Amino acid sequence: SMADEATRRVVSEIPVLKTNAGPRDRELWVQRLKEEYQSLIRYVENNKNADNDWFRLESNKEGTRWFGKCWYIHDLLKYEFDIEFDIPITYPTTAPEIAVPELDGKTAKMYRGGKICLTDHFKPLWARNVPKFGLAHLMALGLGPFLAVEIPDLIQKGVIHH
Protein backbone atom coordinates (compact mmCIF):
# COMPACT_ATOMS: atom_id res chain seq x y z
CA SER A 1 0.00 0.00 0.00
CA MET A 2 1.33 3.44 -1.06
CA ALA A 3 -1.13 4.74 1.59
CA ASP A 4 0.49 2.61 4.35
CA GLU A 5 4.12 3.63 3.41
CA ALA A 6 3.16 7.34 3.08
CA THR A 7 1.55 7.21 6.58
CA ARG A 8 4.66 5.50 8.09
CA ARG A 9 7.04 8.01 6.37
CA VAL A 10 5.17 10.94 8.04
CA VAL A 11 4.42 9.50 11.55
CA SER A 12 7.03 6.71 12.27
CA GLU A 13 9.05 8.92 14.76
CA ILE A 14 5.87 10.24 16.51
CA PRO A 15 5.27 8.33 19.78
CA VAL A 16 2.16 6.08 19.49
CA LEU A 17 -0.65 6.62 22.04
CA LYS A 18 -2.21 3.81 24.07
CA THR A 19 -5.03 4.79 26.42
CA ASN A 20 -8.63 4.69 25.14
CA ALA A 21 -9.98 7.58 27.23
CA GLY A 22 -11.88 10.79 26.60
CA PRO A 23 -12.39 13.96 28.67
CA ARG A 24 -14.94 12.38 31.11
CA ASP A 25 -12.69 9.40 31.97
CA ARG A 26 -10.99 10.73 35.15
CA GLU A 27 -7.57 9.10 35.94
CA LEU A 28 -7.63 7.37 32.49
CA TRP A 29 -8.01 10.82 30.82
CA VAL A 30 -5.06 12.18 32.88
CA GLN A 31 -3.04 9.18 31.54
CA ARG A 32 -4.13 9.81 27.90
CA LEU A 33 -3.09 13.49 28.33
CA LYS A 34 0.41 12.35 29.46
CA GLU A 35 0.63 10.34 26.20
CA GLU A 36 -0.73 13.35 24.20
CA TYR A 37 1.87 15.76 25.65
CA GLN A 38 4.64 13.09 25.26
CA SER A 39 3.70 12.61 21.55
CA LEU A 40 3.27 16.40 20.88
CA ILE A 41 6.65 17.39 22.43
CA ARG A 42 8.58 14.62 20.58
CA TYR A 43 6.89 15.71 17.30
CA VAL A 44 7.86 19.39 18.01
CA GLU A 45 11.49 18.34 18.83
CA ASN A 46 11.72 16.31 15.55
CA ASN A 47 10.20 19.32 13.65
CA LYS A 48 12.88 21.65 15.15
CA ASN A 49 15.66 19.17 14.09
CA ALA A 50 14.24 19.24 10.48
CA ASP A 51 13.91 23.09 10.20
CA ASN A 52 10.08 22.61 10.17
CA ASP A 53 9.02 24.02 13.59
CA TRP A 54 5.54 24.91 12.30
CA PHE A 55 3.17 25.08 15.33
CA ARG A 56 2.65 25.60 19.06
CA LEU A 57 -0.29 24.23 21.12
CA GLU A 58 -1.44 24.69 24.71
CA SER A 59 -4.55 23.33 26.47
CA ASN A 60 -6.81 24.38 29.33
CA LYS A 61 -6.19 22.63 32.68
CA GLU A 62 -8.50 19.68 31.75
CA GLY A 63 -6.99 19.25 28.22
CA THR A 64 -10.50 19.63 26.57
CA ARG A 65 -9.72 22.92 24.77
CA TRP A 66 -6.55 23.32 22.67
CA PHE A 67 -5.29 26.54 21.12
CA GLY A 68 -2.20 28.03 19.57
CA LYS A 69 -0.56 28.99 16.30
CA CYS A 70 0.75 27.39 13.10
CA TRP A 71 3.19 29.01 10.60
CA TYR A 72 3.46 28.31 6.87
CA ILE A 73 6.43 29.65 4.84
CA HIS A 74 5.67 30.40 1.16
CA ASP A 75 8.31 31.98 -1.19
CA LEU A 76 10.34 32.63 2.07
CA LEU A 77 7.46 34.73 3.68
CA LYS A 78 6.07 33.33 6.99
CA TYR A 79 2.26 33.27 7.45
CA GLU A 80 0.88 32.78 10.99
CA PHE A 81 -2.63 31.51 11.79
CA ASP A 82 -4.37 31.04 15.14
CA ILE A 83 -5.71 27.46 15.56
CA GLU A 84 -8.08 25.82 18.08
CA PHE A 85 -10.11 22.62 18.69
CA ASP A 86 -12.32 21.01 21.37
CA ILE A 87 -11.74 17.35 22.40
CA PRO A 88 -14.93 15.34 21.61
CA ILE A 89 -16.49 13.27 24.46
CA THR A 90 -15.96 10.20 22.16
CA TYR A 91 -12.17 10.95 21.77
CA PRO A 92 -9.88 9.26 20.83
CA THR A 93 -12.12 6.98 18.66
CA THR A 94 -13.52 10.23 17.21
CA ALA A 95 -10.99 12.75 15.76
CA PRO A 96 -11.10 16.45 16.76
CA GLU A 97 -12.29 19.20 14.32
CA ILE A 98 -9.39 21.69 13.73
CA ALA A 99 -10.52 25.35 13.32
CA VAL A 100 -8.39 28.09 11.72
CA PRO A 101 -10.85 30.89 12.51
CA GLU A 102 -9.20 33.62 10.33
CA LEU A 103 -9.88 31.39 7.24
CA ASP A 104 -13.68 31.23 8.03
CA GLY A 105 -15.47 31.75 4.64
CA LYS A 106 -12.17 32.16 2.68
CA THR A 107 -12.04 28.62 1.09
CA ALA A 108 -14.60 25.89 0.10
CA LYS A 109 -12.20 23.35 1.83
CA MET A 110 -13.57 24.55 5.23
CA TYR A 111 -17.05 24.56 6.88
CA ARG A 112 -18.56 27.24 9.24
CA GLY A 113 -16.17 28.36 12.06
CA GLY A 114 -13.16 27.81 9.83
CA LYS A 115 -13.21 24.05 10.58
CA ILE A 116 -10.97 22.23 8.05
CA CYS A 117 -12.64 19.56 5.87
CA LEU A 118 -10.65 16.36 6.72
CA THR A 119 -10.24 14.18 3.52
CA ASP A 120 -12.36 11.06 3.00
CA HIS A 121 -8.88 9.44 3.53
CA PHE A 122 -7.75 11.18 6.86
CA LYS A 123 -10.89 10.10 8.80
CA PRO A 124 -10.77 6.34 7.85
CA LEU A 125 -6.96 6.44 8.50
CA TRP A 126 -7.62 7.82 12.02
CA ALA A 127 -10.45 5.23 12.43
CA ARG A 128 -8.14 2.33 11.32
CA ASN A 129 -5.46 3.40 13.88
CA VAL A 130 -7.69 4.06 17.01
CA PRO A 131 -6.42 4.60 19.64
CA LYS A 132 -2.77 4.88 18.50
CA PHE A 133 -3.08 8.33 16.79
CA GLY A 134 -3.46 11.54 18.81
CA LEU A 135 -3.12 15.32 18.47
CA ALA A 136 0.47 15.07 17.06
CA HIS A 137 -0.98 12.88 14.23
CA LEU A 138 -3.95 15.30 13.77
CA MET A 139 -1.35 18.07 13.17
CA ALA A 140 1.01 15.88 11.01
CA LEU A 141 -1.71 14.17 8.87
CA GLY A 142 -4.66 16.64 9.12
CA LEU A 143 -3.61 20.29 9.36
CA GLY A 144 -0.17 19.94 7.69
CA PRO A 145 -1.42 18.63 4.30
CA PHE A 146 -4.33 21.15 4.46
CA LEU A 147 -1.92 24.14 4.69
CA ALA A 148 0.43 22.69 1.98
CA VAL A 149 -2.51 22.84 -0.52
CA GLU A 150 -4.64 25.79 0.72
CA ILE A 151 -2.13 28.49 1.86
CA PRO A 152 -0.35 28.54 -1.57
CA ASP A 153 -3.78 28.64 -3.30
CA LEU A 154 -5.15 31.46 -1.05
CA ILE A 155 -1.90 33.53 -1.53
CA GLN A 156 -2.17 33.08 -5.36
CA LYS A 157 -5.93 34.13 -5.36
CA GLY A 158 -5.03 37.18 -3.17
CA VAL A 159 -7.33 35.95 -0.30
CA ILE A 160 -4.35 35.79 2.18
CA HIS A 161 -1.93 38.77 2.36
CA HIS A 162 1.47 39.18 4.13
CATH of the domain at 52: 3.10.110.10
- Beta-strand runs (E) in the chain: 55-59, 65-74, 77-86, 110-111, 115-116
Give SS3 for 61: coil
Q: Is 79 exposed, middle or buried (0-12, 13-18, 19+ CB in 10 A)?
A: middle
Q: 97-106 contacts: CB < 8 A, separation 24 or more?
A: 98/138, 98/142, 98/143, 98/146, 100/70, 100/143, 103/150, 103/154, 106/154, 106/159, 106/160
DSSP 108-138: TTEETTTEE---TTHHHHHHHHTTS--HHHI
Q: Resolution of this entry in Å? A: 1.8
Number of domains in the chain: 1
Domain of residue 145, residue span: 2-156
Q: Determine, yes or no, domain membership for 23.
A: yes
**Cα Dmax for the chain:** 48
Q: Determine, yes or no, domain membership for 113.
A: yes
55 Cβ partners below 8 Å, 6+ apart?
44, 47, 68, 69, 70, 71, 83, 139, 143
Give SS3 for 55: strand
Q: Determine, yes or no, domain membership for 65.
A: yes
- Confirm whether 70 is a catalytic residue: no
Q: Determine, yes or no, domain membership for 142.
A: yes
Q: Determine, yes or no, domain membership for 162.
A: no
- Helix, strand, coil shares of the chain, percent, nearest 5, are 40, 20, 40
**Choice among 10, 117, 155, 159 that is catalytic:** 117
- Gyration radius from the chain CA atoms: 16
Give SS3 for 153: helix
Q: Determine, yes or no, domain membership for 161.
A: no
